[PDB]
Ligand binder design. Structure first.
Ligand SMILES: O=C(O)c1sc(-c2ccc(Cl)cc2)cc1NS(=O)(=O)c1ccc(-c2ccccc2)cc1
Ligand SMILES: [Cl-]
Lengths: 237, 233
């Protein structure tokens, strides 16, 4: 095919072990998540993959995933572009709560609604939230407009702010012939896959990308996949 | 009162910093990595904040920057890589230790290369074990035939570093962005010579320490207001 695109979702994070909602909280990879990224990078290396430009988020679990991959494929010299628009979904007032605290505060009915809904956001992250200043006041978002900095996101919102970066910055590079690697998060990559494959809301909500695994798209010149996404790695994985 | 921070990477693998590593893409040794950690330590203790980072395309510098960014919790910063910040290209000497250099070319010629600002070493020829490894490396594929060196005098090195400084770094400094630069001995020499208006002899005598933040305070014309200061204990 004309073009080749590779995606990778970061592995386990420090708060995954605590089953706390991270969202825009900047949790690091756990040691296992780091090893996952090493194995994904080794897979890209064994297949001889070469890239020309990399995109990631401003969250260190994704950036460290990208770094680990670039180390394993000996392409640390590649240009790297970071953007908030590839960040994980913003989980609003749920940020920092674990599974038990979430169920305790909101009830399983409300939680089920948030789980299966495409466009209903979680509560907003208010100024008295324990991570409000940690996230909303982080200088890395200093240049965001008031309507750009979310207090909370539905999956719809997440995709709606990821896809402008895709269209305006990634698509031109792919059509320039550059081999792109995107290292990001479950829900931002969902936005990209939903656009690539023309998936429905239900279908994208049922899609769970595996972690630490290179995802390969073969694309024609209009960036339509010519075959299903392919996972790279040993036969087991 | 702009703030500019430079950091020179530390020790590379296989003693290659005592072997004219130049454009060979040697990785840091564990000790050189530890050095970068200590420098990042120092910067975080001091509460330094950056807005943009510049480095070479060589992994010992890149990994140094990565280690600093990790230590100061600023991995989200934008990073620009450029070959123009590469270490000096030592041509045919690349990879040889001091004894092998003397044995191959003689003490008199080696002293001349050591002390001269504008006499390059001999070119890296196809028989050199690094010739195809460096000259056919994909990251240089866009360089014009005049741009890809086979060897560099110190003069050459500074001459290709300065256009990047003037065209890319200066405008960021003038916008008030706090710049971090992680690079190599001789490209950083280029920056320092331009900053302090040093002479050729002076720049050849200056030996920047490794793994230590080097802090510059510049006025509205990018002229240092005081000597460079080092960050540590
Ligand atoms: O079970 C399920 O898959 C989901 S998804 C979901 C949900 C999705 C979107 C919104 Cl906005 C709100 C909620 C709720 C549940 N149920 S849960 O028991 O309360 C639960 C709560 C947290 C976790 C967790 C585990 C690791 C790291 C971080 C969090 C797992 C489960
Ligand atoms: Cl980077």
């Amino acid at each position: 095919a004309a073009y080749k695109l590779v995606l990778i979702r970061h592995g386990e994070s420090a708060w995954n072990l605590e089953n706390r909602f991270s969202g825009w909280y900047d949790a690091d990879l756990s040691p296992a998540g780091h090893e996952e990224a090493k194995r994904g990078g080794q897979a890209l290396r064994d297949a001889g993959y070469e890239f020309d430009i990399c995109f990631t988020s401003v969250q260190k679990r994704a950036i460290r995933t990208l770094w680990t991959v670039l180390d394993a494929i000996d392409q640390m010299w590649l240009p790297v572009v970071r953007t908030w628009r590839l960040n994980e979904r913003h989980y609003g007032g749920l940020t920092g709560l674990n599974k038990a605290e979430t169920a305790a505060k909101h009830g399983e009915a409300q939680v089920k609604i948030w789980r299966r809904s495409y466009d209903v956001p979680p509560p907003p992250m208010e100024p008295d939230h324990p991570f409000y200043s940690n996230i909303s006041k982080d200088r890395r978002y200093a240049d965001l407009t008031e309507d750009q900095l979310p207090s909370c996101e539905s999956l719809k919102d997440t995709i709606a702010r990821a896809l402008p970066f895709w269209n305006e910055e990634i698509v031109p590079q792919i059509k320039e012939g550059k081999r792109v690697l995107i290292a990001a998060h479950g829900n931002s990559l969902r936005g990209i896959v939903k656009h690539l494959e023309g998936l429905s809301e239900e279908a994208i909500m049922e899609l769970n990308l595996p972690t630490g695994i290179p995802i390969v798209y073969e694309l024609d010149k209009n960036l339509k996949p010519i075959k299903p996404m392919q996972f790279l790695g040993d036969e087991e994985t």
